[model samples]
Target: PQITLWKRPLVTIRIGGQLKEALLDTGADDTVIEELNLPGCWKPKLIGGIGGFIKVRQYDQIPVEIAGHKAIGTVLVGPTPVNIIGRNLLTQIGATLNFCGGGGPQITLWKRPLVTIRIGGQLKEALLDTGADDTVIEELNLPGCWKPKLIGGXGGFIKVRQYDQIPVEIAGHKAIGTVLVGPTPVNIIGRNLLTQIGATLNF
Candidate 1:
């Protein structure tokens, strides 16, 4: 969920089978798309936009494909200078805005820094547990059960099997760290392993 500033975030979208490029306007509250013929009835309403107040049609449950992400929700049809995908529909698609640049940066809290870590020659998408002290997994038969380990956190204590120096690949970057195999709520790449992968929580 990383987005770099290079050009406009305008992306091709399909609204009711009509293709058009819409701006990913996280600024706006309602998605105001360009005027287009749509099926079913709509409530004619007026909305104040950049230029001035304009008449718009309120069409609910409209199928809109925002950059290949599928969303069915209210789509306002009006004579807009540019189609805008606003926070209304943006939340449905779970779009996280993470602008990384040399200047001031911003990352949305809507989503986490989930990643695909390699273990046992398999791929797993999990949270980058930067706050955790050690890596954890629910069920993985890792080699060499070096010792019995007990794990406890804000969620309290839990039993675990400790595996030392297990081979791990974070973003295809080679890394080796201790792993606790047990009934963890979710697989997590702790701060230690996360550091080995050259990762850090910027915030």
Candidate 2:
């Protein structure tokens, strides 16, 4: 049987002790965590989107490592079905999406090594989600360095706070950025730090 693997690294993100394997898609624009894995009481907020105001919120902030690199950030959660890695985080890691040369049905992929982060002093594995706009942290388990911030969503006003750029190292590359804080966290790498590093995504 022919095997089909992801072009980049596959990361295992833990949500409340539940492990969910995800693919790093740089083509996407935001970091997406599965809504099913999120906790209640996290009200949604409205961000200006193409359609109108898109409701979003900072979930949780957890320590994440990719290919041995680590970073902590807030994740914006929506009603999307699949978990995604958008431009938010991908640009930070200097990851480029390459889909040129072969537009055929054949699998043209690039794969990065497994990156890990030390959370609560324990190293955990994660994948870079390029589809995300802002850095996200999973809501399940978080470290002390990551404080909680609530903000208003579409419903009403909630609490939300920003964090100092964290120390994250991936593929021998390191960066820091102010991450959003909330009850539930999903770290999405944002453009603030990615532009500083000059990351390109190929399609």
Candidate 3:
């Protein structure tokens, strides 16, 4: 079965006789749940993400059902904004991200597509992530009036400045829309820009 990576790869999963929605995050190495009550002893551990560090309980050998496929592995329990199904379980299910056969050309999963995008007349390198819902820029120094807001994700929520109706140039193609400014390690070109460029994801 194939899966699309457009706008946060999410799927239904079952854990400890309870069903829930979890995000399939290839960028994450371990599977983390919001909070679950299971019969087991857990060890205390700290996990870090884009925002900061968080304390969680690491439970071993827990059964997790993804898309009806059963897999047993370690699951981290904590106060997470969203449940993340990481590579630990993704590999067990043999899941892969695909971006072939869509409105645009075929993209290989072996390498991440690094594209040059011009935002507010400044050139910057950005990763084409279909898993992201919105375009996130690394810096907030662009010349424009912005509305401040908080966006939540795997780690937590971060304060961001959103510039609306901004023109962004990507791969010689131009698009005008809202762009988010925050403290990101790298610039991310999300579905907002990908859709305008006629790109799609196939798994």
Candidate 4:
């Protein structure tokens, strides 16, 4: 298997009668569609983030189909710096991300141990995120359950945690150990679990 950085598949999102092609960033924490590109009907709510409050609208859920696999997530609609696909969607489908032992960047899919998860009774496919340290739910549209915890990075505070122990699934494989969730909207698939599973990357 070749290893390389994980890149998201791009898809066209229709909002307000406009269809814009957006990159699905597996590294991003929330469904940050360009604020200006949002549709008039996608009314996300304004909520407080790590530093302060931002404008966001709440959707019953967003439809996301990855590599032909599809799922619906309770999503937050708002303006984001970039488009992203966070842990919330990845874990539900049980996907493994391998970023080592590769030539150029490539993403390969596996068909085994298919796992599934439900949000607001909607099912979606998940990916295994070996590079993440904690589980995350991006703009998870759930009510107030996850408490706010600040996340510090090399520079300083990068984001905040909503709660811990977010539910996740590993596709084609079951988690050998318990997965830990963060108390914020940030999504992650930790290395600890990936190492235990011996997940390999396609080179």
Candidate 5:
């Protein structure tokens, strides 16, 4: 099944006979979970992320269920901010990041997950961009009135009309929040929506 990278590439997972949600973090070298009781001899290990470093227990040959895929490997348990299914396990599941070719300086890119979103009773495909600070919709006349504002991005800034309290449904999850409208090539679902659905980004 294709995973949607909504704000974070979050997915339902099962470990140690308990069901939970985990972030698919390609930047992480190992899978880390919040403290859990599992019978095994663990070695103390330290791992670092954007914040800093934390001590974790390395448990070898552990089984984890990602969505419905079975993956058996090392799983670190400790005081992690969130459960993370890192590249260590993502690679085991044959998960590969896709980058599309374009002009200008060559660079590696992670393909944004596309998901169906229903807005104003119309279903549309939008990119789940966790990197984006706010949700942006392609230029369209939505149902309600909006407030005009200027937003900035890597390419600079753009004038946008911010609509508030809009109903958006994604992957059976519903959220009501603000959505900006402008001349965007693709619709974006940002952290605002992801947080409403209890999603997290683990790097």
Candidate 6:
């Protein structure tokens, strides 16, 4: 299952016998939760992000559970506007992110809508990334000058070369927009390109 442009599936999880809502941020390395007075050993640590640095208390071997899976992971408590469960905790929890309305166990990978794609007269297959902001293709050369750019997906950013106004065809529909070239095996047709295809990502 996947989330659309307006519909947000902000995960509400269970932790320490209490319920809390959080956003799964892949780019973050630490689990930053605002609720405090958790039972454990803690030390003062400053975690920095888009805003200024934050003075947070770090607790090790803290218990956190979600989706019937529990893990003894680190928890950072501070006065943050929202809660974020990031890499370190998610890695230890052995998590797989899947979105759907059902309350059952995850069965498979994220849903991919495969579509016919053509770039510079080269026909290929790519996924329709309904949530992506920029279009990204695997390692291939476009006939014009391209500049390197960064895109956020997992932990780190993808350094892809950007080409503008490239003629790209999606499922026999003509679309002209910015194309990005990266070293990834999975190609994604993002809104930057597919927005021109008159595609409606409705539920």
Q: Estimate each model's TM-score.
A: 0.49, 0.35, 0.72, 0.37, 0.51, 0.49
For candidate 5, lDDT tens digit of each residue in 1-203?
54434445678999889998987754456788898887799999988643346788999999998888888999999887778777667766766543221111121213335768898888888865544557888887787788998765323467889999999987557889999988776688777775565444321
Local distance difference test scores for all models: 0.66, 0.44, 0.74, 0.44, 0.70, 0.64
Error of 3 at 185 (Å): 3.8
User: CA lDDT of 110 in candidate 5?
Assistant: 37
Off by over 4 Å in 2: 1-10, 15-18, 36-43, 46-54, 99-203
TM-score of 4: 0.37
Clashing pairs in 5: none
Clashes of each: 0, 67, 2, 39, 0, 0
> In lDDT terms, which candidate is top?
3
Give per-residue lDDT, candidate 3, residue 131: 51
Best model number under TM-score = 3
RMSD of 2: 15.8
lDDT per residue (tens digit) for residues 1-203 in model 2 = 11122233356665445566655654344555655545545656544321134556656554444333444545567654345554555444555532222231111223432245433234544334333344444443333355555543223333445566565543334556655544423334444433333343432
Q: Of the pair 1 and 3, which is ahead by TM-score?
A: 3
Q: What is the lDDT of candidate 4?
A: 0.44
Which 10 consecutive residues of model 1 have the lowest summed lDDT?
Answer: 98-107
Candidate 1 local Cα displacement, residue 179, angstroms: 51
Model 6 CA lDDT for position 101: 26
* Backbone-clash count (model 2): 67
Candidates 4 and 5, the one with greater lDDT: 5
Q: Kindly list the per-residue Cα lDDT of model 1 for residues 69-145, writing each as its tens digit.
A: 88899889887666777767777787654322312233343445566788877788765543356788768778665
Off by over 4 Å in 4: 1-3, 6-20, 35-53, 99-203
Listed per candidate, the RMSD to the true structure in angstroms reads 15.9, 15.8, 3.8, 11.9, 12.0, 8.8
List ranges where model 1 is wrong by over 4 Å: 99-203
TM-score-sorted candidate list, best first? 3, 5, 6, 1, 4, 2
